[PDB]
């Protein structure tokens, strides 16, 4: 049982860094600052980061390095009763790969479309335009970049819903193929090659962020955007919604208990200082988000100042921000083609090494549980990515966005929250902090402070519950603009979201009815960890 290991410390770090930072740092974090009181939002964000995200982040990394197995095996060895967490986690990572990678596909599509003297999303006199098109964002109107991304790139207007996916965009299917070809030839030999691909995919975003920061700040009106970005409004701290947005952002932007840090750390040396790794990577992830904020809003202020557009219409979140709003500003500045190609290549690398982690979480968790596919890695992941691609063509259809949007709001959003919730309960109460603090001490030489133990035991479950409850309160039958999803689409969504959580009692009830003795004598066998 002594497995492979990282061919260099940096390979692991850049793998965790690469996974942890993605488009969410770019397209969610700065918008929250803007929405929830600017710099004042850093206080609930920072506190939720200190007592919520980083403890959970540290926990999984320690769990990975210590037990040295993938998600399924590690949790089974930790608590036999709650082994389904491993399965719940893996198929979540499985569901996300179905829709997440198309964001990278969209990135490459814009990357190819940027090989022109004139960027095609500048004007409103193209074949794919409507009388409602205006050169930039406006209330009651559509923008040239919005109509380019919608009526040309997506051809979403030709879909009446999710029942009507329409024809297949083969220019998009090709890009999705290229995405998986990269993903294939980065993960098929394991961390020996993956730990090298992340040297580009995790470092290029910082190369791009740097010169997009310079170009962003050199622009007229840049300082105006920084005002919109970080002008403190501490009244927000008194609001419970701000804390919930902070808590939610911190959690999903660090990705703890998702089975990927677990898998990545499982290849670490046993006596590696994983505590220093947790703190270093957590900081870099949040620092990247902070820097990305300046990158985004420097251009946002430039638009509000020299392009005469309202700040309300451009300070947005999600794919609307980098596929519509930001490229719209790029096409107006000198050397537009250069900044376009680099931006889009940033967003691509920003998602790639995250997609690596998600997939690797699956492949590692399965190789440790099933030797059949550990011996045949390349064959398995080829079948895996082929499966991804085949159904991924549905995301490449005219109504492909409707498919993407459904999974996004159901596939992993709620499932992983109650999954990680059971993780915190399992290690801090079933497995106990006592035994976990002991494990960590044997590794890095010293036990966690009383701080981490309190956080793992009391703060983390409340933190996770504070988010799950919050996403439930703000629930709303799935819609997009005017379009309202049919009831069955919403029902299917809860099935996908439910097919993960149901693994928790399913195997619990299963392994219970597989045990000799009495009811009190089932829990002890299924409570006692693997180390015996």
């Amino acid at each position, epitope marked *: 049982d002594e497995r492979e290991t990282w061919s260099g410390k940096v390979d692991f770090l850049l793998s965790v860094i690469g996974f942890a930072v993605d488009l969410a740092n770019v397209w969610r974090f700065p918008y929250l600052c803007y929405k929830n009181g600017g710099g004042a939002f850093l206080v609930p964000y920072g506190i939720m980061l200190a007592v919520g995200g980083i403890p959970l982040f540290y926990m999984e990394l320690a769990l990975g390095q210590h037990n040295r197995k993938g998600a399924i095996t590690c949790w089974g060895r930790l608590v036999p009763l709650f082994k389904g967490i491993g399965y719940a986690v893996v198929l979540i990572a499985f569901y996300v790969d179905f829709y997440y990678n198309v964001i990278i596909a969209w990135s490459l599509r814009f990357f190819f479309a940027s090989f022109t003297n004139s960027l095609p999303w500048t004007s409103c006199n193209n074949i794919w335009n409507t009388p409602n098109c205006r050169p930039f964002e406006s209330q009651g109107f559509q923008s040239a970049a919005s109509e380019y991304f919608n009526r040309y790139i997506l051809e979403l207007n030709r879909s009446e819903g999710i029942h009507d996916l329409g024809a297949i965009k083969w220019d998009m299917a090709l890009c999705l193929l290229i995405v998986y070809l990269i993903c294939y030839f980065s993960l098929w030999k394991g961390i020996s090659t993956s730990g090298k691909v992340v040297w580009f995919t995790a470092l290029f975003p910082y190369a791009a962020l740097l010169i997009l920061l310079i170009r962003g700040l050199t622009l007229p009106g840049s300082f105006l955007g920084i005002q919109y970005y970080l002008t403190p409004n501490f009244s927000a701290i008194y609001k419970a919604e701000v804390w919930a947005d902070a808590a939610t952002q911190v959690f999903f932007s660090l990705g703890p208990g998702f089975g990927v840090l677990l898998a990545y750390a499982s290849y670490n040396k046993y006596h590696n200082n994983v505590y220093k790794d947790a703190l270093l990577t957590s900081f870099i992830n949040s620092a990247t988000s902070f820097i990305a904020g300046f990158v985004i809003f420097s251009v946002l202020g430039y638009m509000a100042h020299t392009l005469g557009v309202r700040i309300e219409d451009v300070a947005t979140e999600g794919p609307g921000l980098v596929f519509v709003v930001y490229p719209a500003a790029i096409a107006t500045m000198p050397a537009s083609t250069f900044w376009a190609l680099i931006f889009f290549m940033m967003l691509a690398t920003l998602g790639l090494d995250s997609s690596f982690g998600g997939s690797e979480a699956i492949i590692t968790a399965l190789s440790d549980e099933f030797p059949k596919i550990k011996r045949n890695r390349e064959l398995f992941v080829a079948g895996l990515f082929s499966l991804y691609f085949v159904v991924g063509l549905a995301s490449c259809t005219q109504g492909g966005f409707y498919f993407f949007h459904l999974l996004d709001r159901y596939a992993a959003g709620y499932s992983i929250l109650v999954a990680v919730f059971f993780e915190a309960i399992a290690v801090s109460w079933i497995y106990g902090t006592n035994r976990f603090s002991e494990d960590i*001490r044997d590794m890095i030489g010293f036990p966690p402070g009383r701080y981490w133990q309190v956080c793992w035991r009391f703060v983390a479950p409340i933190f996770l519950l504070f988010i799950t409850v919050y996403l439930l309160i703000g629930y709303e039958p799935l819609t997009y603009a005017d379009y309202v999803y049919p009831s069955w689409a919403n029902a299917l969504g809860w099935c996908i979201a439910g097919s993960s959580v149901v693994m928790i009692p399913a195997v619990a009830i299963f392994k219970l009815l597989s045990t000799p003795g009495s009811l009190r004598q089932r829990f002890t066998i299924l409570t006692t960890p693997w180390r015996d």
Partner: antibody
Amino acid sequence: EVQLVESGGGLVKPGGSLKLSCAASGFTFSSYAMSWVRQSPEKRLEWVAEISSGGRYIYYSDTVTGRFTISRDNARNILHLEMSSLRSEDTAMYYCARGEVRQRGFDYWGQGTTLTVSS
Amino acid sequence: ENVLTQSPAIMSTSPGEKVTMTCRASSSVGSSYLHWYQQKSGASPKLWIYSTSNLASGVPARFSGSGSGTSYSLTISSVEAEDAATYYCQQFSGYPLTFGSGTKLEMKR
């Protein structure tokens, strides 16, 4: 406040068997890893065995391994060291010592207890 | 095992003198894993200097340590008469844990 007292020890013929103990008081004993360190006649220090805070991690020295066994009682706060197949090289002042943190070493030592192995 | 060798074995010192005893390892030791102990006659050892730089509590400022890899040392700025003891270096880098041969401080007259 912190106090460690070793008991047992004494004269033992080669091949003999004895169980050393250490009573701890003044701290959460279940929260710290204990070690046995023995001193030569010559007043040289030699580490014998380490046991973790929950006893789930055990380490022995090459001279000691296979013969001695370090134990724990977190209920009564007692550290134990059973010795068997005793040799004349095991003659030493055996110290109850505790360090949780590798980085800080053994911050507390017991008064010790003398074991003599001779024919 | 990683055997630690201390020199000198015996050191004659008058109070007020600056002295430096060395601890040499056969294998590389992490700076945060080498420690120093003082042992008075007829007493149990006390943690003196942990991680080769940090004095334990009660330890006078006159004591200090330095070193890295396979060469460390305990240095006293100004020896006092109450320093007449034996000083042991110990590594907790790898198992088995090993102590140094020891350095004994004796006074002059």
